[PDB]
Design an enzyme around this catalytic site. Sequence first.
Site, PDB file in Angstrom:
ATOM      1  N   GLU B  38       0.809  -1.219   0.000  1.00  0.00           N
ATOM      2  CA  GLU B  38       0.000   0.000   0.000  1.00  0.00           C
ATOM      3  C   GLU B  38       0.843   1.271   0.000  1.00  0.00           C
ATOM      4  O   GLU B  38       0.387   2.313   0.457  1.00  0.00           O
ATOM      5  CB  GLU B  38      -0.950   0.020   1.205  1.00  0.00           C
ATOM      6  CG  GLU B  38      -1.774  -1.247   1.373  1.00  0.00           C
ATOM      7  CD  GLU B  38      -2.944  -1.319   0.411  1.00  0.00           C
ATOM      8  OE1 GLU B  38      -3.708  -0.334   0.324  1.00  0.00           O
ATOM      9  OE2 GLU B  38      -3.099  -2.364  -0.258  1.00  0.00           O
ATOM     10  N   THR B  43       0.494   2.108  -8.119  1.00  0.00           N
ATOM     11  CA  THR B  43      -0.003   3.377  -8.645  1.00  0.00           C
ATOM     12  C   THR B  43       0.999   4.023  -9.597  1.00  0.00           C
ATOM     13  O   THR B  43       0.637   4.492 -10.677  1.00  0.00           O
ATOM     14  CB  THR B  43      -0.316   4.370  -7.509  1.00  0.00           C
ATOM     15  OG1 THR B  43      -1.187   3.749  -6.556  1.00  0.00           O
ATOM     16  CG2 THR B  43      -0.974   5.630  -8.063  1.00  0.00           C
ATOM     17  N   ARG B 173      -7.169  -0.704  -5.969  1.00  0.00           N
ATOM     18  CA  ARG B 173      -6.221  -1.504  -5.199  1.00  0.00           C
ATOM     19  C   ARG B 173      -6.281  -2.987  -5.576  1.00  0.00           C
ATOM     20  O   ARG B 173      -7.348  -3.600  -5.536  1.00  0.00           O
ATOM     21  CB  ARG B 173      -6.493  -1.344  -3.703  1.00  0.00           C
ATOM     22  CG  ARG B 173      -5.644  -2.234  -2.815  1.00  0.00           C
ATOM     23  CD  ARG B 173      -6.055  -2.095  -1.361  1.00  0.00           C
ATOM     24  NE  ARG B 173      -7.447  -2.487  -1.161  1.00  0.00           N
ATOM     25  CZ  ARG B 173      -7.838  -3.723  -0.871  1.00  0.00           C
ATOM     26  NH1 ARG B 173      -6.940  -4.691  -0.748  1.00  0.00           N
ATOM     27  NH2 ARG B 173      -9.124  -3.998  -0.706  1.00  0.00           N
ATOM     28  N   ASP B 195       8.428  -4.417 -10.128  1.00  0.00           N
ATOM     29  CA  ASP B 195       7.730  -4.420  -8.849  1.00  0.00           C
ATOM     30  C   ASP B 195       7.663  -5.843  -8.319  1.00  0.00           C
ATOM     31  O   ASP B 195       6.986  -6.688  -8.901  1.00  0.00           O
ATOM     32  CB  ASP B 195       6.318  -3.846  -8.997  1.00  0.00           C
ATOM     33  CG  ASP B 195       5.604  -3.680  -7.665  1.00  0.00           C
ATOM     34  OD1 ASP B 195       6.189  -4.010  -6.611  1.00  0.00           O
ATOM     35  OD2 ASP B 195       4.435  -3.239  -7.676  1.00  0.00           O
ATOM     36  N   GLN B 199       5.816 -10.292  -2.401  1.00  0.00           N
ATOM     37  CA  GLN B 199       6.734 -11.419  -2.376  1.00  0.00           C
ATOM     38  C   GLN B 199       6.852 -11.827  -0.928  1.00  0.00           C
ATOM     39  O   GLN B 199       7.421 -11.087  -0.128  1.00  0.00           O
ATOM     40  CB  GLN B 199       8.097 -11.038  -2.964  1.00  0.00           C
ATOM     41  CG  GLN B 199       9.120 -12.168  -3.001  1.00  0.00           C
ATOM     42  CD  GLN B 199       8.800 -13.224  -4.035  1.00  0.00           C
ATOM     43  OE1 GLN B 199       8.881 -14.418  -3.759  1.00  0.00           O
ATOM     44  NE2 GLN B 199       8.444 -12.788  -5.240  1.00  0.00           N
TER      45      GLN B 199
HETATM   46  N1  LIG Z   1      -4.848   9.667  -1.128  1.00  0.00           N
HETATM   47  C1  LIG Z   1      -3.807   9.124  -1.797  1.00  0.00           C
HETATM   48  N2  LIG Z   1      -3.894   7.827  -2.184  1.00  0.00           N
HETATM   49  C2  LIG Z   1      -2.877   7.243  -2.859  1.00  0.00           C
HETATM   50  C3  LIG Z   1      -1.677   8.034  -3.163  1.00  0.00           C
HETATM   51  N3  LIG Z   1      -0.838   7.218  -3.830  1.00  0.00           N
HETATM   52  C4  LIG Z   1      -1.447   6.008  -3.938  1.00  0.00           C
HETATM   53  N4  LIG Z   1      -2.668   6.034  -3.372  1.00  0.00           N
HETATM   54  C5  LIG Z   1      -3.624   4.911  -3.256  1.00  0.00           C
HETATM   55  O1  LIG Z   1      -3.170   4.082  -2.182  1.00  0.00           O
HETATM   56  C6  LIG Z   1      -3.290   2.703  -2.524  1.00  0.00           C
HETATM   57  C7  LIG Z   1      -1.956   1.976  -2.379  1.00  0.00           C
HETATM   58  O2  LIG Z   1      -1.239   1.995  -3.608  1.00  0.00           O
HETATM   59  P1  LIG Z   1      -0.654   0.630  -4.236  1.00  0.00           P
HETATM   60  O3  LIG Z   1      -0.385   0.919  -5.703  1.00  0.00           O
HETATM   61  O4  LIG Z   1      -1.625  -0.523  -4.122  1.00  0.00           O
HETATM   62  O5  LIG Z   1       0.754   0.403  -3.478  1.00  0.00           O
HETATM   63  P2  LIG Z   1       1.535  -1.005  -3.309  1.00  0.00           P
HETATM   64  O6  LIG Z   1       0.748  -1.941  -2.418  1.00  0.00           O
HETATM   65  O7  LIG Z   1       2.852  -0.784  -2.599  1.00  0.00           O
HETATM   66  O8  LIG Z   1       1.767  -1.676  -4.668  1.00  0.00           O
HETATM   67  C8  LIG Z   1      -3.807   2.639  -3.946  1.00  0.00           C
HETATM   68  O9  LIG Z   1      -5.198   2.341  -3.882  1.00  0.00           O
HETATM   69  C9  LIG Z   1      -3.637   4.034  -4.495  1.00  0.00           C
HETATM   70  O10 LIG Z   1      -4.737   4.356  -5.342  1.00  0.00           O
HETATM   71  C10 LIG Z   1      -1.661   9.442  -2.705  1.00  0.00           C
HETATM   72  O11 LIG Z   1      -0.677  10.182  -2.926  1.00  0.00           O
HETATM   73  N5  LIG Z   1      -2.736   9.896  -2.049  1.00  0.00           N
END
Ligand SMILES: Nc1nc2c(ncn2[C@@H]2O[C@H](COP(=O)(O)OP(=O)(O)O)[C@@H](O)[C@H]2O)c(=O)[nH]1
EC number: 3.6.5.-
Lengths: 339, 337, 55
Positions: B38, B43, B173, B195, B199
């Site tokens: 997250e 994103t 997500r 990415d 993992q």
């Molecule tokens: N409010 C807000 N939400 C974000 C931002 N960046 C990402 N998100 C949201 O936070 C969530 C986590 O991102 P994600 O791509 O799943 O990260 P990962 O789990 O590390 O691959 C996603 O639903 C994005 O849409 C931001 O700058 N602000």
Amino acid sequence: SAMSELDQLRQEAEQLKNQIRDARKACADATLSQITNNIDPVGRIQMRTRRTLRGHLAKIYAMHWGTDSRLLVSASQDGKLIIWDSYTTNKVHAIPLRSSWVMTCAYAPSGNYVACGGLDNICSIYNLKGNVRVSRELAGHTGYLSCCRFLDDNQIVTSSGDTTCALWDIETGQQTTTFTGHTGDVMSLSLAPDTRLFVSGACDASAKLWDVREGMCRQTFTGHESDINAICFFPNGNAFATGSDDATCRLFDLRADQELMTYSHDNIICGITSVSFSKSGRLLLAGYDDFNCNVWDALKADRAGVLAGHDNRVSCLGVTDDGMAVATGSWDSFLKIWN
Amino acid sequence: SAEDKAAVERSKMIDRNLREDGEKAAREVKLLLLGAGESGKSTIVKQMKIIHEAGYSEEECKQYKAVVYSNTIQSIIAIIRAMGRLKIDFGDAARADDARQLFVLAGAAEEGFMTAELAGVIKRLWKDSGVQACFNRSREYQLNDSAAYYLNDLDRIAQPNYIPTQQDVLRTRVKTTGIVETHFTFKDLHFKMFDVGAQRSERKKWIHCFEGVTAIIFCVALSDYDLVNRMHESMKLFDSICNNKWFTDTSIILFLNKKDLFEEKIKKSPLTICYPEYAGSNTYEEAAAYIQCQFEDLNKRKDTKEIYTHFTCSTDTKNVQFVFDAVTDVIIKNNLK
Amino acid sequence: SIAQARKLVEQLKMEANIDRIKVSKAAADLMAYCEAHAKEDPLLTPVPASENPFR
Ligand SMILES: Nc1nc2c(ncn2[C@@H]2O[C@H](COP(=O)(O)OP(=O)(O)O)[C@@H](O)[C@H]2O)c(=O)[nH]1
């Protein structure tokens, strides 16, 4: 109150561990080195590079011989699987991978299929019967795929960084038997000759014997001071050898349920990537991080030789079914056939 | 030594093809996405497709329509579940009927289906004062950051002819265990962005596989500071990554993400939650910089390695575009010879 | 902690009840196998340079 029941379960586990330690010590009347003392040593047997396989553009993380003792496969992170003709050094096939991150490869005993896997957490089955295309993709491992081996064309056993091994039914594409109870990443696996059992190396510094049919751990072997990166069965299926990051090789016996012998040398401190027995099982070959491959006498616990053809660490080993040739692979992108 | 020559000819055909693939592979820049779940890694990958490639067309967005519905449902459900744990009653007792009907209708399909009936249920729940009171307490349980985004836009999302915008797609997500690889071209340079996704293992074993990649983009969520400690957990991971021997020649790029959330959140929740020794005022600028210092002090290579830090909002296509332009320049400047 | 703590105890019991053979017997059997196939091992036994594929 939950702690009080946990304290009991801890104490019981301690008692059981002590019993096994004591039962194993009662078992040792003598040692492997004592009984083999009258056996004439191998001596120093010099080998030579008889073939040098070129055309890999990156680190080779794995290789597997064919059952015909001629063809072999290799997995490099260049994103390619290459089937080699070891006699003529001709490239038989070059297989593009959908994921360039691949930590293992395997060659079906029938020669009909080849598998590979890696950080994609998937074991991909490729059909070799013009060119080559993927047949099955077996998913569901939440960790990286460290190793895989064919029982036959319809069955393959895999190991993963999510700490579990697995038996797969390839036809259905579904996991048949899941093997749990490792507390660390499983780096390697080896099937018994009869495929009744298989053993696994892991980051928990322990090796585990599993029942394939009934799907359970039989025995657990310990004593390694670091991760077990490699494991291999002794030809009769009554023993197995383990390579590790503690720089040591250890021979374990199944019936004795303990460690028979340690193969290590002062001044060898580097981790061990791969292990393989010779045909008679007298020789144990081990790939090292020091760019070499050391040849050990299995019975005498002495080093029978050394192989340095590589400018980078030796990542994997293999020995033909006829025992005619030794294959090494490395991060230097080259494969070498020794004889 | 005659007819077997046909096999040799095929070997040379193969040998040339490897050479061709190898030439083009060498000109590709390899980026490595890291950081906790997250954190915005998925994103950013989408933003690379949006900015430096065609982006998401109508047909590509329509693929995500199902995921939009799934994320919406899973969000409101998570809040309802938390209401029980936090002893938060409904504003209207009749909403308990919608809450049940939600879980029942949530069972109707393993994919995200959206019908008028379900929309009405989610809407009435979302408007309910009890659910809103549990929402404001979202720092006490696991909840999506895109939750209020979808639920406030529900009237639009519930439409029969609804198609996802590019912002909708960025906000979705999804969790994949397998490593995700992507390609794009920017400033005549070819990029492979990796990415690891989810993992699940001990990183020590697979970490050396990435030795020699051009740069590492490590994503950190600023807003995790008040959650149970996710921030300190991220520092430990970064401490391991930045100082890793395998990454010595790899440029370490640090994204402090979700800066939009953190700026609003710092108005309520103090930074002392995460860093009790913090004697500074609670302001977006000071607090964000403090966190930056905490991550950068972890560098034991300070005389050698440099940490390139950025304050980013990854849902903002423009802000990412600007920052990645700086990312591009650092790669060129730091590695050329 | 988790109730899986009981499962481990049970596994340890399965680890505990087994047939255990004296080492010298296991050690002799390994020697026996090695000597049996010793002549069949090409790395131990220098197969004629004529017949081996790599020459
Ligand atoms: N409010 C807000 N939400 C974000 C931002 N960046 C990402 N998100 C949201 O936070 C969530 C986590 O991102 P994600 O791509 O799943 O990260 P990962 O789990 O590390 O691959 C996603 O639903 C994005 O849409 C931001 O700058 N602000």
